[PDB]
Ligand binder design. Sequence first.
Ligand SMILES: C/C(=N\Nc1nc(=O)cc(C)[nH]1)c1ccc(N)cc1
Ligand SMILES: [Mg+2]
Length: 340
Amino acid sequence: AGAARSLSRFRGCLAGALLGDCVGSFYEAHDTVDLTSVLRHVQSLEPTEALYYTDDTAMARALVQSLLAKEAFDEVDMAHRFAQEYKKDPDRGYGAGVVTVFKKLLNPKCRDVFEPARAQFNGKGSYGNGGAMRVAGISLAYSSVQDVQKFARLSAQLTHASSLGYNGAILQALAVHLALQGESSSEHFLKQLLGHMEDLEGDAQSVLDARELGMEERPYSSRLKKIGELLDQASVTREEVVSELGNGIAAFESVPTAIYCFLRCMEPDPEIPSAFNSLQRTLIYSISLGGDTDTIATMAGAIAGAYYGMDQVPESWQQSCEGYEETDILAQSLHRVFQK
Ligand SMILES: C/C(=N\Nc1nc(=O)cc(C)[nH]1)c1ccc(N)cc1
Ligand SMILES: [Mg+2]
């Protein structure tokens, strides 16, 4: 993968996300998934564009297309691109909630593009993982922690106005940010994320948002702490992971899980054949958790792809995915424009 923030890492990041979405799609909303099944099914990749992407990729592409068009974050442009993408291709797997947001954004009378998201859930906003599932491009465009946080938040808030939603997007963007920096201990990676989340969850609004939902005072911080405990635990089963971290559509029940998958799979697992590389292993492992496989795998894939780089993206897998060339072009353009 080479240096921090290399072309290879950019390409690997978006390819990894695409793979997770396309391959994870087959198992979406499966309560349980058998590992042998995933393996058998990834054999079906080996020897074009046979696997459709979902809303995860559709929104990721629109986000990145906005950043490229403006060479900056522009809420009006990005909001419009999200809404127009839905309009043109509505059957990509959007929830009814975010569709309500899109319909409001499509009204040419809508001046304030943040207001639709805020009206959701009786004015409290969605805590879904939709803000995070598309956020990797933010970490490609912006190098500083400060900017990653600011624009992961803003991009997320166009559809997910609950701090439980947009803080999940920040966490995912931070994970990609770190992975683009290259080789790290799992301990150092986790500690860096924990520090950032502890700082964010100090905010008074974040504290109130959690309290309303009966959650721990610092939800993501507490979940990252659990990840540290899990990584030290003997004979952790896929069920115990799901049990402690979740595999759901809430950002809190999917973003930490995706990060755990990345961290866990830094090391060889005897349960996944050693022939699979580290990226492949991460994707296989994350999909085998079940639940929202598509988003958990797209997020784990973004992190892993940034970390391992394009050399770990198997051409046979990549070429099975709808739009892999467009995805690759977007990654190279992000590098040219923002990491020249
Ligand atoms: C923030 C929130 N809900 N957000 C949400 N997003 C989702 O995707 C799904 C669900 C169920 N709920 C909230 C709503 C009411 C109160 N009383 C307190 C908080
Ligand atoms: Mg999807």
